[PDB]
Each structure stands twice: as C-alpha cells, then as structure tokens.
C-alpha cells in the first residue's frame, strides 16, 4: 500500500533537523499530540515542515 510510496520519498528529501515545541498526551484519551519543525532540503532548496501530529495508543 504505502511501502513503495515510503521508499520513493527517501530519494527526494534530505532532512536537516527536528525541533519539538509542544507535546500533550493523556492516558484517559489514549491520544496525544506533538508539534514540531522538521527542516529539510529537496532538489537543493531549503524548506521547513510545521505540523502537529496526532498519535493514539493501542494495546500494552
């Protein structure tokens, strides 16, 4: 499904750093969030992802 999407995305990006600036989670929600800046370069141009990813807990 994604697996070749994922490998294919490796050739195109050079990662330059990760900065986490917000984080929350809670046992009762089985949910948490991570806000971050991920710096990269693609085809010689610098750029930056700013994103709040959501994670959830299953099992354990």
């Amino acid at each position: 499904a994604f697996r070749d999407d994922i490998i294919a995305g490796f050739a195109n990006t050079r990662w330059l750093g990760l900065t986490i600036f917000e984080h929350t989670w809670s046992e009762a929600e089985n949910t948490g969030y991570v806000s971050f800046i991920a710096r990269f370069s693609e085809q010689g141009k610098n750029g930056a992802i700013i994103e709040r990813s959501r994670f959830i807990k299953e099992n354990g």
């Binding site: 499904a1 994604f2 984080h23 948490g32 991570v34 971050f36 990813s53 299953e58």
Partner: protein, 60 residues
C-alpha cells in the same frame, strides 16, 4: 567518536531513538515516537515507519 541521535536529543543514537527502532524498547510517549519516526525517515528505514503507523492506515 560516536553517534548522537538524529533525534537532536544529544544522546547516543543506540540509547535514544535506536532502542525504539530496533524493537528493544516500547516508545513511552508520543514525543519519543515522533522522534523515532523522524529518525527512521533520516535512516530510510521503511519497515519501522510501517510498524509505527496506526494499523487502520494499512501502511504495509
């Protein structure tokens, strides 16, 4: 000389994100998971990304 984690955490990779990518340590919170997936992007480890994607997304 050694190998500070691409986490950016200033720990050895084998003691930061590497323990999680290897399957030896369960990621204790979303922040650690986020760091470890950023590493897998840096290290072009597609299998760890698949394994840390929520199962309903069908990452395989």
């Amino acid at each position: 000389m050694s190998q500070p984690c691409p986490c950016g955490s200033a720990d050895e990779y084998s003691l930061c994100c590497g323990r999680i990518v290897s399957g030896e340590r369960v990621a204790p919170d979303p922040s650690h998971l986020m760091r470890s997936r950023y590493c897998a992007f840096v290290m072009k480890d597609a299998d760890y990304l698949i394994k840390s994607w929520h199962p309903t997304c069908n990452a395989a």
